[PDB]
Amino acid sequence: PRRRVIGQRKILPDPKFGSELLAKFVNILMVDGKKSTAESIVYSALETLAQRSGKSELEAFEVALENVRPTVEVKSRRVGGSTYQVPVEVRPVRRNALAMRWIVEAARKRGDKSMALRLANELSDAAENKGTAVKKREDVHRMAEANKAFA
Amino acid sequence: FCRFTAEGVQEIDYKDIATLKNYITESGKIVPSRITGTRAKYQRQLARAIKRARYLSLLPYTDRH
Amino acid sequence: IKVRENEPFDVALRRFKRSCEKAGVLAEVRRREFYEKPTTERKRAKASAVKRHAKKLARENARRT
Amino acid sequence: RKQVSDGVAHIHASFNNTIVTITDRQGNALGWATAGGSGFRGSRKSTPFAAQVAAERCADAVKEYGIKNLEVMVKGPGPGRESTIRALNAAGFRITNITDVTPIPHNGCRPPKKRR
RNA sequence: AGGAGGUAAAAAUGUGAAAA
RNA sequence: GCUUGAGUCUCGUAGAGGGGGGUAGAAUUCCAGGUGUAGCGGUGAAAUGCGUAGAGAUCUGGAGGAAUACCGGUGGCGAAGGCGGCCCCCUGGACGAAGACUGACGCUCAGGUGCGAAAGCGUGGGGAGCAAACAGGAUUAGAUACCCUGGUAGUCCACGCCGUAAACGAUGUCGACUUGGAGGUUGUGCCCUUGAGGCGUGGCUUCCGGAGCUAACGCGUUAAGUCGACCGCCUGGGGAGUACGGCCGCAAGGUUAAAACUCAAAUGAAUUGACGGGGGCCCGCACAAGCGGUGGAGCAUGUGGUUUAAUUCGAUGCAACGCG
Numbered sequence: 037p038r039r040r041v042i043g044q045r046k047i048l049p050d051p052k053f054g055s056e057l058l059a060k061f062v063n064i065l066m067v068d069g070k071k072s073t074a075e076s077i078v079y080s081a082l083e084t085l086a087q088r089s090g091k092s093e094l095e096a097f098e099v100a101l102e103n104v105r106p107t108v109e110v111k112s113r114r115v116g117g118s119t120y121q122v123p124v125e126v127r128p129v130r131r132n133a134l135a136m137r138w139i140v141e142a143a144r145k146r147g148d149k150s151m152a153l154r155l156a157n158e159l160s161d162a163a164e165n166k167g168t169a170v171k172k173r174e175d176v177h178r179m180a181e182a183n184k185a186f187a
Numbered sequence: 188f189c190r191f192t193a194e195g196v197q198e199i200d201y202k203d204i205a206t207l208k209n210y211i212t213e214s215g216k217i218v219p220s221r222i223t224g225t226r227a228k229y230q231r232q233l234a235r236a237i238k239r240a241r242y243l244s245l246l247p248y249t250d251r252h
Numbered sequence: 253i254k255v256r257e258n259e260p261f262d263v264a265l266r267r268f269k270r271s272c273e274k275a276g277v278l279a280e281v282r283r284r285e286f287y288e289k290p291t292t293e294r295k296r297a298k299a300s301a302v303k304r305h306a307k308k309l310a311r312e313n314a315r316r317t
Numbered sequence: 318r319k320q321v322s323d324g325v326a327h328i329h330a331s332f333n334n335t336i337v338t339i340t341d342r343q344g345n346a347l348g349w350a351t352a353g354g355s356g357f358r359g360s361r362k363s364t365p366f367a368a369q370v371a372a373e374r375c376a377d378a379v380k381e382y383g384i385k386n387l388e389v390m391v392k393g394p395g396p397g398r399e400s401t402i403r404a405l406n407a408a409g410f411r412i413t414n415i416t417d418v419t420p421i422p423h424n425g426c427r428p429p430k431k432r433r
Numbered sequence: 434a435g436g437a438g439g440u441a442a443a444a445a446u447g448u449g450a451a452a453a
Numbered sequence: 454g455c456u457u458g459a460g461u462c463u464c465g466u467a468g469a470g471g472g473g474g475g476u477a478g479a480a481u482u483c484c485a486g487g488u489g490u491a492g493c494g495g496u497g498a499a500a501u502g503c504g505u506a507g508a509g510a511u512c513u514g515g516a517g518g519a520a521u522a523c524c525g526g527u528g529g530c531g532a533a534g535g536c537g538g539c540c541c542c543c544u545g546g547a548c549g550a551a552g553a554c555u556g557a558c559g560c561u562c563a564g565g566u567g568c569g570a571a572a573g574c575g576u577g578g579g580g581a582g583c584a585a586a587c588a589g590g591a592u593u594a595g596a597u598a599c600c601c602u603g604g605u606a607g608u609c610c611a612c613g614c615c616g617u618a619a620a621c622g623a624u625g626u627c628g629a630c631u632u633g634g635a636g637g638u639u640g641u642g643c644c645c646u647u648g649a650g651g652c653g654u655g656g657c658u659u660c661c662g663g664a665g666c667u668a669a670c671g672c673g674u675u676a677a678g679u680c681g682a683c684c685g686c687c688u689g690g691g692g693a694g695u696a697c698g699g700c701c702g703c704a705a706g707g708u709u710a711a712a713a714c715u716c717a718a719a720u721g722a723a724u725u726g727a728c729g730g731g732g733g734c735c736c737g738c739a740c741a742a743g744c745g746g747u748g749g750a751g752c753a754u755g756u757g758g759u760u761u762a763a764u765u766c767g768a769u770g771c772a773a774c775g776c777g
Contacts, residue, residue, distance in 0.1 A: 037737080037740080068745090112741090116439070116440050117439075118363075120360070130742090137743090185361060185364050185366050190648075191649080195649075211524080212523090214254070214523090215523090216523045216524080217523055217525090218523080218524075219523080219524070220525095220526085221526085227526065227637085228467080228638080230524065233524085235538090237524065238524085238538055238539060239539065239540090241478080242478095242539050242540085243539095247478085247479095249478085250254065250418070251418050251420070252478090253416060253417045255415055264399070266398075269398065271436070272437095273417070274394070274395070274398050274438085275437075275439080276436095276438060277522080278394050278438080279437090279438060279439085280437090281522065283428045284430055284431065284432065286430075298527095299527085299659090302659095303660090304435085306635095325511080327511055329510060334493075334494080334509095336490095336493080337510085338489085338509095338510045339511090342512090343487085343511085343513095344511040344512030345511075346488060346510075346511055346512095347490090348490090350490095351490085351491085351509085353494085354490080354491060354492055359499095360498085396438070420479065420480050421479075421522065421523095422481080423478080423479055423480070423522060423538080424520055424521055424522060425481070425518080425520055426482085427520075429584070430583090431600090
């Protein structure tokens with residue numbers, strides 16, 4: 037809680053190319069410790085995202101990631117006061133990591149399909165900034181511009 | 188730690204309002220002797236001479252007039 | 253407060269604010285007076301502050317530096 | 318309307334709200350402000366960021382009259398004195414004099430007691 | 434170093450004999 | 454008669470010393486007029502109250518009063534209390550280099566008298582801001598408390614009365630003697646004034662301590678240290694600084710001031726842990742940033758309550774409760 041910080045953690049990406057970037061989606065798309073069942077699904081979840089949004093797997097993800105990429109985050113800080121909030125802009129390390137948080141959060145809903153085919157909807161949605169993960173990214177945008185009264 | 192009317196004795200008055208603009212700061216406020224180096228009865232006497240200008244409307248009550 | 257900085261006022265120059273007003277005396281001049289509660293407070297706090305003058309004059313201690 | 322040229326801005330300020338009266342060298346004031354008329358009711362009403370929007374109520378609804386070069390004359394307290402004034406600067410006007418002129422007393426009439 | 438501003442609302446009763 | 458005791462005078466220093474009266478501005482409060490807007494206000498939170506009658510609000514002006522932001526300091530005066538915007542009138546006590554003079558007029562003092570912050574009362578006022586009792590509104594177990602908005606007396610002035618404190622440096626008054634060091638303040642002497650200077654000589658105080666003293670903390674040149682003088686106070690706590698009576702007070706009571714009775718305590722410093730809705734620092738997933746379980750449901754299990762012939766017994770936050 038107080039003093040020492042470790043560096044980076046080491047996860048294991050998809051078996052076509054070494055990509056810690058895309059693995060952070062995949063390891064959070066990894067449900068229940070199952071890389072395997074994810075490995076059947078996250079490729080099919082990448083099969084639907086890329087060539088239906090337009091780009092190949094290098095930059096098709098930031099079609100559905102930079103659009104869900106936030107810029108503002110808020111948190112409550114008092115120095116001894118009226119329990120108010122002192123917000124800051126977040127660094128690159130957590131910002132697009134928070135962008136990956138909404139997409140797996142949007143992965144659960146819209147259920148008449150498979151987990152493969154539930155991920156097909158929102159990744160195609162988040163590509164053209166019409167995403168339900170992007171919808172939660174648009175809620176975090178409105179927690180700025182009026183709730184920054186302490187700094 | 189400055190030199191004054193301690194051992195090289197002198198007088199200080201109310202008429203010299205320009206020097207009496209120095210023993211107040213630049214709003215009309217009498218700064219304590221503690222910062223300006225002067226002495227207490229060399230200010231307490233002058234405090235009446237400050238107010239004798241404030242009675243005679245030369246160094247103000249306030250900077251809103 | 254009495255600042256114009258005639259044509260360029262692009263920088264605020266707010267250093268006559270804090271130690272003179274707007275928080276400093278403004279949190280100490282309004283109420284809670286009793287005419288001698290400051291003599292229950294000047295005798296506590298300035299004696300805690302004139303010893304803050306004196307504790308640097310008794311500076312030689314268990315440093316060994 | 319008269320399109321008053323020289324104005325005198327009296328930010329009659331407090332911690333929570335402020336009845337700013339947008340006067341002239343005469344004193345006549347068609348424009349106004351409160352931090353409560355804007356709103357943000359509750360704890361957030363005790364903000365000079367709301368007095369900024371009140372000073373933004375001094376920065377709109379008078380563009381029809383064009384309140385040119387002005388004397389900022391703020392009276393009263395407020396611990397956020399880098400929020401209320403520059404919104405009046407944000408109006409596109411000019412501040413001729415930046416004055417925090419307050420009626421500082423000589424303690425004539427009796428004050429009561431508080432903080433218990 | 435020399436000095437200022439922001440600094441606390443909810444949680445009570447243990448009513449009676451326990452040591453060489 | 455003398456003089457180191459006390460006092461007077463010459464030459465200088467200082468300020469809220471005390472009583473009274475003139476006179477100024479800012480702050481704030483009410484109001485008329487121009488302009489003008491739907492909110493103003495307050496707190497831990499909220500509401501009350503107020504505003505469309507045109508409030509809060511800006512400027513000009515009229516009508517008010519007391520306290521004096523900064524100057525302003527454990528600095529000054531005095532018997533204490535207490536008293537500070539400026540000036541004027543009357544008047545007061547103290548300190549010192551250097552001398553004259555009366556020639557011990559010195560010290561304290563129950564009775565008696567006067568004064569005394571503050572609150573209260575009687576007669577007439579200041580009457581703006583604040584403000585016991587009071588109403589409304591939150592918190593709340595009751596709130597008849599802390600808090601907010603108005604508001605009676607009061608805070609201010611004249612003459613009397615009550616004559617009371619934490620009137621606290623809790624240390625009565627006067628005198629003498631008794632290593633000091635660091636500052637504030639008013640005096641001031643010898644020397645080359647040859648710069649804010651070298652070295653001494655008194656008073657009023659803050660801090661650390663030797664001698665000495667003390668239960669300890671600690672006092673320490675204003676001593677709780679070394680002695681003498683006068684007045685006052687004390688005799689276990691509580692009961693009670695109450696009651697009968699007396700002096701005095703219109704009143705409220707003050708003051709002198711017991712007893713019956715009960716207990717074997719009461720009171721004070723310090724020691725070591727504990728406690729704080731005191732703090733600094735450090736630690737633990739205490740928390741902030743997350744995923745999945747417990748709690749809704751079927752099933753598997755233990756105790757309690759209950760019923761009963763017993764539904765062995767014990768444990769009964771825990772760390773007994775899928776325990777023996």
